[PDB]
Amino acid sequence: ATAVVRCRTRLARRVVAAVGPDGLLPAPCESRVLESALALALLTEERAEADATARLTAYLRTTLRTAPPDPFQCAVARAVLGDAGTALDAGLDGFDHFTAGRKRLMFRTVLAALGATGFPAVPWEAYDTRPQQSWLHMEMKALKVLAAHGTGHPDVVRDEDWRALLPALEPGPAWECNNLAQLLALLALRHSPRHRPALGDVLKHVAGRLRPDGGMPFIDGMTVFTTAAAGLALSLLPAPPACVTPMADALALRRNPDGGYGFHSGVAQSDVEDTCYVLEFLRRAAPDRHRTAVAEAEGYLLALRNPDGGFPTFARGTSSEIAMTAAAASALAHDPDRREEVDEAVRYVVRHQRPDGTFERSWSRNATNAVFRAVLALTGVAAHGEERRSRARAAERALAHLAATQNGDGGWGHAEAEPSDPISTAYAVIALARGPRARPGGPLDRALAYLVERQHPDGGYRSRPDQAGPRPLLYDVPALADVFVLLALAHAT
Ligand SMILES: CC(C)=CCC/C(C)=C/CC/C(C)=C/COP(=O)(O)OP(=O)(O)O
Ligand SMILES: [Mg+2]
Ligand SMILES: [Mg+2]
């Protein structure tokens, strides 16, 4: 076989071996500076868990010394270990996203709660948010409470604000597997005498979440997302392995009542990205075995569709997103009954392509993620006549963007001038596999050679992470590197 096929084979063996007998690919999240700093602040204020606070302190100092994060997270750590405005302007430097205004308020209020800057001089309504992802309501309310107390106006807080924080007082792992939301909520709730009876027991569980490096992860893991993407990659191999069936079973039995999927076990909030990967995987590996789950997932997506033809991440009425719209278009194209919705989705994608051929950054911090989603929809959804031409021209500009920005080593980074990483390159390979056939020395050929060269002796890949949340803050689920490279190699061979 070719070097590429040999690389694909070794990687597939590794991914298959990582899937457990429960059908799941474990996908823990690494410690993160932001949540470690908030856990340290919370435990310090409550004079609790001295051993955990010492490990968190050591984790923060080591990480700042050796692998400092973005400037906002560095400022948060320095505030707890101990200008903020310049760190926020830099951490939000050119953050081109519809959530920018909320993020400025959120991040500044976090820094102010930790004593590093003044609280935003905004009307309290600035913290109001429309229902979206379940935990985001809690984060905003926690920050409102912290601001009201921090400015000396605790009477401002209303019973409806406290009520939003009650899930943070439940025992066990964080509600919706989100440690950031629980920590912010607990930092607020410790100001409330009538909630303090429940604080002691939750602090014990929080302290118990420390990872071996002494830090706190953003989330418990991403095993649904990771298992679905890995199952899809395996189902695109010439001869998919037997384990795709228990993987499909493990995902289907975790579907939410609305028919969608969250990112990890126990996440009740469904989202379009998780659901599209599950749907794409089930369509290939178990379309009859899990016919009802497939239909429920399709119904989930259709119920979220926005009037402009695009799809949001979590809730109808929130802004459509390009990558979510392209993912849903592709996931729904398998049913000839949804031709109209699919075509309106692909037209949305074409309308929002930028003058340079790119699309958007959102849940990924590289440009190649949305390019790969868009190109799959533009080239996979059936189309003829003028609409074929329109879609072909759009896909050409996206693939041209990739060729124009390819690094000398054959890979791509998070932005045009960043060093290459395997995940950003994997997304680009998925897209390029829908262009002309590979030729010696061409962009796809060179990208595949980059991936061949980056394979570790143990068969896997190590990569800078690309996932963000809250956007644009990166978090690291290392299992995704193998999975997305395999997805790329399965598409390209
Ligand atoms: C990769 C993927 C599954 C994409 C869809 C979004 C999603 C469910 C992400 C998984 C990780 C996570 C808990 C993000 C929360 O972002 P946030 O709610 O803090 O973000 P925001 O404040 O920027 O809206
Ligand atoms: Mg958030
Ligand atoms: Mg969050």
Side-chain angles (χ1 to χ4, degrees), residues 33 59-69 73-75 77-78 81:
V33 165
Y59 162 84
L60 287 172
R61 297 195 178 283
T62 295
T63 304
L64 295 179
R65 181 190 324 117
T66 66
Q73 291 194 71
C74 292
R78 293 194 300 265
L81 294 170

Side-chain angles (χ1 to χ4, degrees), residues 166-220:
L166 292 180
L169 300 173
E170 299 170 6
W175 178 65
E176 298 292 79
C177 298
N178 189 320
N179 293 317
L180 172 61
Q182 187 177 22
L183 292 165
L184 290 173
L186 292 173
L187 285 165
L189 286 161
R190 62 171 295 275
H191 295 279
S192 179
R194 73 191 127 111
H195 296 89
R196 286 192 60 84
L199 189 55
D201 276 7
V202 291
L203 291 193
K204 299 180 198 297
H205 197 276
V206 167
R209 292 168 203 173
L210 257 44
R211 288 179 54 79
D213 63 6
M216 181 67 71
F218 167 41
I219 53 179
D220 282 74

Side-chain angles (χ1 to χ4, degrees), residues 151-352:
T151 59
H153 305 101
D155 289 346
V156 165
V157 180
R158 310 180 78 87
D159 287 337
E160 59 176 353
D161 302 323
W162 294 121
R163 195 193 215 288
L165 307 183
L166 292 180
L169 300 173
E170 299 170 6
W175 178 65
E176 298 292 79
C177 298
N178 189 320
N179 293 317
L180 172 61
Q182 187 177 22
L183 292 165
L184 290 173
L186 292 173
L187 285 165
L189 286 161
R190 62 171 295 275
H191 295 279
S192 179
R194 73 191 127 111
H195 296 89
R196 286 192 60 84
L199 189 55
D201 276 7
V202 291
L203 291 193
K204 299 180 198 297
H205 197 276
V206 167
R209 292 168 203 173
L210 257 44
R211 288 179 54 79
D213 63 6
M216 181 67 71
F218 167 41
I219 53 179
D220 282 74
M222 278 184 104
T223 193
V224 172
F225 183 80
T226 304
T227 300
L232 179 58
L234 294 168
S235 75
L236 289 168
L237 292 174
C243 66
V244 295
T245 294
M247 296 172 79
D249 295 343
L251 294 169
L253 64 88
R254 289 175 166 77
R255 70 193 182 279
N256 289 322
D258 61 11
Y261 297 81
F263 63 87
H264 194 66
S265 298
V267 175
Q269 176 70 62
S270 304
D271 68 271
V272 164
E273 184 136 33
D274 280 295
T275 303
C276 285
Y277 274 122
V278 173
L279 177 53
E280 294 275 28
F281 173 42
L282 295 182
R283 271 287 180 191
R284 289 173 177 76
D288 295 326
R289 182 182 184 94
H290 292 295
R291 175 276 162 187
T292 300
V294 167
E296 285 179 356
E298 294 172 340
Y300 168 81
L301 295 173
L302 295 170
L304 290 191
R305 202 174 69 103
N306 282 328
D308 61 13
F311 291 74
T313 301
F314 295 114
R316 203 222 302 282
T318 305
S319 174
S320 296
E321 303 190 25
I322 301 177
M324 300 296 91
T325 300
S330 291
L332 291 166
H334 300 271
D335 185 353
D337 279 46
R338 284 60 175 267
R339 309 168 179 281
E340 286 195 331
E341 291 87 346
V342 168
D343 285 341
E344 296 174 12
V346 180
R347 297 179 191 126
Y348 179 99
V349 172
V350 171
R351 290 198 307 269
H352 284 89

Side-chain angles (χ1 to χ4, degrees), residues 112-177:
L114 300 173
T117 193
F119 284 94
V122 297
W124 304 119
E125 291 74 27
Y127 293 90
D128 299 335
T129 58
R130 178 186 190 180
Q132 306 173 47
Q133 60 262 58
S134 56
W135 54 86
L136 171 67
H137 187 69
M138 210 171 72
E139 297 166 335
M140 298 310 294
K141 289 291 198 182
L143 291 163
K144 187 193 181 190
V145 170
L146 288 167
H149 281 262
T151 59
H153 305 101
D155 289 346
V156 165
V157 180
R158 310 180 78 87
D159 287 337
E160 59 176 353
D161 302 323
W162 294 121
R163 195 193 215 288
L165 307 183
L166 292 180
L169 300 173
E170 299 170 6
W175 178 65
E176 298 292 79
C177 298

